[PDB]
């Protein structure tokens, strides 16, 4: 119930997120750049977090929300969006996410996210 799969393109942006769930103590099941390989670990690792990037939506990650859904009902999945993107969150709160946080990151805010929703 620790394990978080981190999804984003940006390799620091990626093990900056699991240098802070880490700490919290919380524990990276694994890692995807987009929303394919995301469904596809997801399916590999049944992670018990996933963290989902939005900031890109040609990159299309709300219709990764919903395919994991489909997978698995019951999938706490956080999106991480950026300043102004509200609507987006919206659209993912929408197709189920329960939460976000924003770029960048302030660790706090990360751990109560997935403190949350744990």
């Known amino acids: 119930g620790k394990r978080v799969l ?3 393109d940006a390799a620091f942006m990626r093990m900056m997120l699991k240098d802070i769930i880490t700490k919290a103590g ?5 890692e995807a750049t987009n929303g394919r390989e995301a ?3 997801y399916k590999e690792l049944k992670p018990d977090i996933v963290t989902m990037d939005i900031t890109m939506p040609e990159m299309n990650g709300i219709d990764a929300i919903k395919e994991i859904m489909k ?10 969006s950026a300043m102004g993107q ?13 939460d976000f946080i924003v770029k ?5 805010r990360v751990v109560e996210a997935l403190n949350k929703v744990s």
């Open 86 to 98: 509200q609507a987006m969150v919206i659209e993912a709160i929408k197709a189920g996410a329960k």
């Open 26 to 30: 919380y524990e990276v099941a694994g």
């Open 39 to 41: 469904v596809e670990k």
């Open 104 to 108: 960048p990151f302030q660790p706090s």
């Open 6 to 8: 981190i999804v984003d």
């Open 71 to 80: 997978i698995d009902p019951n999938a706490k999945i956080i999106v991480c």
